[PDB]
Amino acid sequence: RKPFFSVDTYSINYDILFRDYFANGIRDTARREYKLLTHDEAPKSGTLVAIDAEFVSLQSELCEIDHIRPKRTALARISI
RNA sequence: AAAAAAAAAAAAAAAAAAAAAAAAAAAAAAAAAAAAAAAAAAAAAAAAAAAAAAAAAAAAAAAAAAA
Numbered sequence: 724r725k726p727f728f729s730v731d732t733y734s735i736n737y738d739i740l741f742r743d744y745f746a747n748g749i750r751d752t753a754r755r756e757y758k759l760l761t762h763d764e765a766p767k768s769g770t771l772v773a774i775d776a777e778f779v780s781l782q783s784e785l786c787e788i789d790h791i792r793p794k795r796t797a798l799a800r801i802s803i
Numbered sequence: 804a805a806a807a808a809a810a811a812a813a814a815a816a817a818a819a820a821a822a823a824a825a826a827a828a829a830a831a832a833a834a835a836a837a838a839a840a841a842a843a844a845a846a847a848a849a850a851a852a853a854a855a856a857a858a859a860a861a862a863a864a865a866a867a868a869a870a
């Protein structure tokens with residue numbers, strides 16, 4: 724007879740949005756970069772960001788339609 | 804002086820009651836009266852009376868991605 728509770732009722736860390744953390748450390752192709760958030764550009768409600776992920780498939784399948792499991796993907800790249 | 808054994812094996816034996824013409828009664832309206840194996844012998848399952856079965860449930864997808 725206990726109730727459930729959400730993390731929206733809680734207090735969440737956000738600073739990983741406001742920094743980078745990566746174990747590659749090469750950080751090359753330094754273009755107009757994956758520029759880090761600060762709290763002047765802190766995220767809001769109702770606001771919009773764009774997002775695009777590129778995928779790769781990792782599964783071998785069978786014929787499956789003829790009158791080893793059906794192929795599914797995984798993520799390869801993300802640009803937000 | 805018709806005076807018989809007084810019951811094995813749970814023996815064995817009673818009935819717990821009638822046409823009534825007693826008086827001047829014709830010839831089946833019964834509802835059906837109705838026996839044969841035994842030479843290695845007769846042999847339904849499904850669930851069992853259609854006294855009224857309309858019986859295509861629309862379709863159309865121009866095509867993906869994901870640079």
Ligand SMILES: [Mg+2]
Nearest residue numbers: 867868869870
């Ligand atoms: Mg596409």
